[PDB]
């Protein structure tokens, strides 16, 4: 727990220092300026002012002595001994620390219960706001409709996206796809006329942080461009666990910020058959791996008897080789364990998916890409003064036991190579499972990651490989990379296994004519 506290202190004190530098101001003014940028929502501004009240005068004192954020946070004891973010020799650290010494909430009784209620729903990966308990929400975050189709009736547990339509939806839109009622000419229900025989299916992601599109905007950490507008998305991002599933390559339903034209798998499936409107679920968690998926897979919502079938993407693309343990190789999953873990998941899916479903296993990428692309580039926190490379950033995180992938985010080339060998072996295990293992309620397919193909296509497009990686964590594929990978999966399945995606619905135009945007998302 010291790790996060240390990292959080070092980030905050770094922004304060750089805001002072950028604006040529006192530290007092820089702290007031940061608080002025933060929204009131989620008590962020008030928390900022509380911190300034509590620690402001000590921060002023130490930053005035020209100590950097890492030293300050040890001195204030947010960090406990020594992890260097900024380049400074050991001798200079011992100097500064002796001089520093020389120079120098859910316990609220009315919050405890709601805090536990929120921690629980997050741990179970189910929406906190869900009156009828069908796991679909009217609220966007806290596992709400950013993560799955919005509930059109939160007072009816039999109304939710992906349901087979009750009574062809004559009187209610029971599956939230915006199609319901009867044609006045022939009295035929629109959902019957427009969706019967079209074989609707949902998209379900079983994913990790990359699949849920973990993303810390570098705008939150770069003083030179910071403003009130930088942090408007901070409350919702925090209550989404710093994930942005609504923009992900598999389950995204908002229009891309990036400016590439590639669309999510959900968007493509909705476009192929508009009856699939709102039928997405991101069953994804930061840190998810083949080993621990069983701890939250029960949050998936698909009633075997009453729901349309689904396409399920199994996308554990790294945490079976990526971990934060100093001796990192012993915690990497073995091929034999991977086989046992995946078979357990598939056996579980078989008894919880409607017949006619499809499961796609994703291979693991080769992540040596991370070090090679980034190690000599400057991290957002090092860009002002050109003093924190990604190598220094990775080393700092490793010292804090917070590096999310010690095997690849490492200056040790032999270890980077070993990690890639293991990832390939695990991908080959997934491949073999898809080729040889059969289940009653779904068929099973393998698609490799093949980031070399994505990097090549990106290079043809005029891009550089470093532009495919989240700038703040230096680890996850960013929104562009995620959409490029989803496009590759879509095309490959379209070419080899077109039945997985179904046919285009010939009534799509008539659906749009009668129902417009089908209620939106």
Ligand X SMILES: *[C@@H]1O[C@H](CO)[C@@H](O)[C@H](O)[C@H]1NC(C)=O
Q: Which of residues 386-425 bind ligand X (CB under 6 A)?
A: 412, 414-415, 418
Asked if residue 344 binds ligand X (CB under 6 A), the reply is no
Q: How far is the CB of 155 from Ca ion (least distance, A)?
A: 7
**Cα 352 from Cα 339, distance rounded (Å):** 20
Residue 261 CB partners (closer than 8 Å, separation 6+): none
Burial of 286: CB neighbours in 10 Å, binned 0-12, 13-18, 19+: middle
Q: How far is the CB of 333 from ligand X (least distance, A)?
A: 16
**Site residue total, Ca ion (CB under 5 A):** 17
**Cα 446 from Cα 436, distance rounded (Å):** 11
Choice between 478 and 518, CB closer to ligand X: 518
Q: Which one of Ca ion, ligand FAW, ligand X, none interacts with residue 311, CB within 5 to 8 A by kind?
A: none
Closest to 384 measured CA to CA, from 15, 11, 12, 3: 15
**Cα 426 from Cα 160, distance rounded (Å):** 36
- CA dihedral over 465, 419, 473, 313, signed as positive or negative: positive
Q: Which one of ligand FAW, ligand X, Ca ion, none interacts with residue 177, CB within 5 to 8 A by kind?
A: Ca ion
Burial of 192: CB neighbours in 10 Å, binned 0-12, 13-18, 19+: middle
Choice between 353 and 405, CB closer to ligand FAW: 405
**Residue 363 contacts residue 449 (beta carbons within 8 Å):** yes
Asked if residue 279 binds Ca ion (CB under 5 A), the reply is no
**Cα 364 from Cα 151, distance rounded (Å):** 34
Asked if residue 448 binds Ca ion (CB under 5 A), the reply is no
Asked if residue 170 binds ligand X (CB under 6 A), the reply is no
Asked if residue 307 binds Ca ion (CB under 5 A), the reply is no
Q: Which one of ligand FAW, Ca ion, ligand X, none interacts with residue 172, CB within 5 to 8 A by kind?
A: ligand X
What's the start-to-end Cα distance of the chain, in Å?
38
Q: Which one of Ca ion, ligand X, ligand FAW, none interacts with residue 155, CB within 5 to 8 A by kind?
A: ligand X
Q: Which of residues 324-343 bind ligand X (CB under 6 A)?
A: 329
Q: Which residues bind ligand FAW (CB under 6 A)?
A: 11, 208-210, 214, 216, 286-287, 317-319, 322, 365, 367, 369-370, 404, 451, 468-469, 472-473, 475-477, 481
**Binding residue (CB under 6 A) for ligand X from 5, 25, 172, 350:** 172
**Binding residue (CB under 5 A) for Ca ion from 21, 58, 65, 132:** 132
**Cα 442 from Cα 302, distance rounded (Å):** 13
**Cα 227 from Cα 282, distance rounded (Å):** 32
Q: Which of residues 133-162 bind ligand X (CB under 6 A)?
A: 153, 155-156
Please give the DSSP secondary-structure letter assigned to residue 214: B
Asked if residue 177 binds Ca ion (CB under 5 A), the reply is yes
**Cα 429 from Cα 419, distance rounded (Å):** 15
**Binding residue (CB under 5 A) for Ca ion from 11, 179, 409, 430:** 179
394-403: buried (b, 16+ CB within 10 Å) or exposed (e) per residue? bbbbbbbeeb
Token output for 291: 């080993």
Cα 375 to chain center, whole Å? Answer: 23
Q: How far is the CB of 420 from ligand X (least distance, A)?
A: 12
Q: How far is the CB of 410 from ligand X (least distance, A)?
A: 8
The binding site for Ca ion (CB under 5 A) comprises 130, 132, 134, 136, 151, 153-154, 156, 159-160, 169, 173, 175, 177, 179-180, 191
The binding site for ligand X (CB under 6 A) comprises 153, 155-156, 172, 329, 412, 414-415, 418
């Amino acid at each position: 727990s010291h790790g996060q506290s240390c990292l959080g202190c070092v980030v905050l004190v770094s922004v304060i220092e750089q805001l002072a530098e950028v604006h040529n101001s006192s530290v007092q003014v820089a702290m007031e300026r940061l608080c002025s940028y933060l929204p009131e929502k989620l008590f962020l501004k008030t928390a900022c002012y509380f911190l300034v009240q509590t620690f402001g005068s000590d921060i002023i004192k130490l930053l005035d002595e020209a100590m950097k954020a890492d030293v300050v946070c040890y001195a204030l004891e947010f960090c406990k001994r020594q992890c260097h973010l900024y380049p400074l020799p050991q001798e200079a650290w011992e100097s500064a620390l002796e001089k520093a010494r020389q120079v120098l909430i859910c316990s609220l009784p009315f919050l405890t219960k709601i805090c536990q209620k929120i921690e629980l729903s997050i741990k179970k990966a189910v929406p906190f706001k869900d009156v009828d308990s069908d796991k679909h929400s009217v609220f966007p975050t806290l596992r709400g409709y950013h993560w799955r189709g919005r509930d059109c009736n939160d007072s009816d547990k039999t109304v939710y996206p992906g349901r087979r339509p009750d009574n062809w939806d004559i009187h209610q839109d029971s599956n939230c796809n915006g199609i319901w009622g009867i044609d006045p000419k022939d009295g035929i229900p629109y959902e019957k006329k427009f969706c019967e025989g079209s074989q609707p299916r949902g998209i379900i992601l079983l994913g990790d942080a990359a699949g849920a599109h973990f993303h810390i905007p570098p705008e939150w950490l770069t003083a030179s461009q910071m403003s009130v507008n930088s942090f408007l998305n901070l409350p919702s991002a925090l209550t989404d666990e710093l994930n942005w599933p609504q923009l992900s390559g598999v389950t995204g339903f908002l229009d891309s910020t990036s400016g590439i034209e590639e669309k999510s798998i959900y968007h493509r499936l909705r476009k192929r058959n508009h009856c699939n409107h709102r039928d997405y679920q991101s069953i994804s968690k930061n840190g998810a791996s083949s080993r621990n998926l069983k701890n939250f897979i029960e949050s998936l919502s698909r009633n075997q008897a009453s729901d349309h079938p689904a396409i399920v993407l199994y996308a554990m693309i790294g945490n079976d080789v990526c971990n934060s343990k100093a001796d990192t190789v012993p915690e990497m999953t073995t091929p034999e364990q991977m086989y046992a873990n995946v078979m357990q998941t598939l056996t579980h899916l078989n008894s919880h998916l409607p017949n006619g479903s499809h499961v796609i296993l994703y291979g693991l990428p080769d992540g040596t890409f991370l070090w090679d692309s980034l190690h000599n580039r400057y991290h957002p926190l090092g860009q002002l003064n050109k003093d924190v490379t990604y190598a220094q950033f990775f080393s700092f995180l490793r010292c804090l036991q917070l590096n999310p992938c010690n095997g690849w985010m490492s200056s040790n080339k032999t270890l980077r190579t070993l990690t890639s060998e293991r990832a390939e072996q695990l991908s080959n295990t997934l491949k073999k499972i898809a080729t040889t293992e059969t289940f009653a309620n779904f068929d099973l397919f393998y698609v490799d990651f093949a980031f070399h193909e994505i990097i090549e296509d990106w290079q043809k497009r005029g891009g550089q490989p470093w532009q495919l990686i989240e700038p703040v964590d230096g680890f996850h594929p960013n929104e562009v990379a995620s959409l490029l990978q989803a496009n590759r999966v879509w095309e490959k399945i379209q070419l080899q296994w077109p039945h997985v995606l179904g046919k285009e619905n010939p009534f799509n135009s008539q659906i749009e004519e009668v129902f417009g945007d089908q209620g939106g998302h």
